[PDB]
Amino acid sequence: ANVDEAILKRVKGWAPYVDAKLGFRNHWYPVMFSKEINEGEPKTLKLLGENLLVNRIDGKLYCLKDRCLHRGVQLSVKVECKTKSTITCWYHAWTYRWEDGVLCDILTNPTSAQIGRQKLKTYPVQEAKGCVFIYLGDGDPPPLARDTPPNFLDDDMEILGKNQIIKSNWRLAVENGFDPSHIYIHKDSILVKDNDLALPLGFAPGGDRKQQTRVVDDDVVGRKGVYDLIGEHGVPVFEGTIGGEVVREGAYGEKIVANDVSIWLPGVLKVNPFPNPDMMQFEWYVPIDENTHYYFQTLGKPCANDEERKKYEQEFESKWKPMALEGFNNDDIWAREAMVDFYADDKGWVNEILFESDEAIVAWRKLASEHNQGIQTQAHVSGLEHHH
């Protein structure tokens, strides 16, 4: 219950989604790149509103809630890792094992009855393709593949990227990304001209509602998502008109891209091919709190050896990162920021006036509402409550 019930009652098709202001619990989420955290170098981060600590011990990553069980302070205010396998709160020295969060010692009172009888929350952590994924959920985690778009985990797919904190709720980021008509904001991107892209201004839908998308709920690995098929029956718009007069044209480059776009739970977009005919872009919009998200950008390109990988890395730093990730997606950032006010009071979820291409967004809202693995609430953050 994160949103006024009066509002939720109004939204029949996707109330769970509108209520998921803090994101969906029980899903895997990338939070940083592997090279950003080294041996015995504890790192702090907030995911789904929860303060966490991640550390690498003997190469393996561990995640502990950054909040001592005693007086609720963050252990990270003054980190004290007195033994390889533990962390000691700086306040009264309650000591926890990184491996299972068990309170194994208390330096201020070695005879305390709490020793061995309390456990600090831990979360599964997995590294894949140079990315650090945390399963922000309870119980045994499902395969990481379930929460990743197709091909991200392919053997030869070399993954490179960038991550940053953006000031907008995660859902605004997701919808902007999967928004078929938002392509209009990218009409002047340096990438369009500098990489000779063909880029429409928008689309004139064709066919019926069901044909605008393809809802995926039959994938064998269990992934749940939606493909944007507006271009299968729709006519792309290359001539923008006002009063029947052409005021703007799309891009007539030779490189064809982004004709395969899909959004997947918990909130990751796959644009293929992009930003080049031989590459793929996968981006996550990870919930940090109700007002911010991690914009986790990755570009994938098949590489057969260290030679090709190095070449790709060099092209990434010199071209793709500055020209695409920044030169193209920077407009998506302020676009997301521009919707904040309208949805900040939760009223935008009621007052928005949608048009045809939004069918794709609606499909996603319904899929997310039906297949998410749980709604994160303030109670999960402060401490679950329940009266006998």
Binding site: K9, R10, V11, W349, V350, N351, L354
Partner: protein, 104 residues
């Protein structure tokens, strides 16, 4: 001019039927008790199909945002709807439902 939509009995009380029209916007026929009414099917506030909404008396509630309209006058009954719905007179004769071809 009238469009033969269906048999009165094809619709259970309190239900809604979407009527597609080639080269024109679809309509929504509502069965309120034993009375039949009709309006454009697309909510004037967006792209929702009113035929997939909830009927309460002579008021159809949009499934998207909870906006609503009186299916008899087509006038908004609940926010965020503000643009009146197009209304089509309906007549039942010999157990068959007919809806005017053009708004009125």
């Amino acid at each position: 001019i009238w469009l033969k939509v269906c048999a009165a009995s094809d619709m259970q009380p309190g239900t809604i039927r979407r009527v597609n029209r080639v080269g024109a916007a679809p309509l929504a026929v509502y069965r309120v008790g034993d009375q039949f009414y009709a309006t454009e099917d697309t909510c004037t506030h967006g792209i929702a199909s009113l035929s997939e909404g909830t009927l309460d008396g002579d008021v159809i509630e949009c499934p998207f945002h909870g906006g609503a309209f009186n299916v008899c006058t087509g006038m908004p009954a609940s926010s965020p709807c503000t643009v009146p719905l197009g209304v089509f007179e309906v007549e039942v004769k010999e157990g068959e439902v007919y809806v005017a071809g053009e708004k009125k």
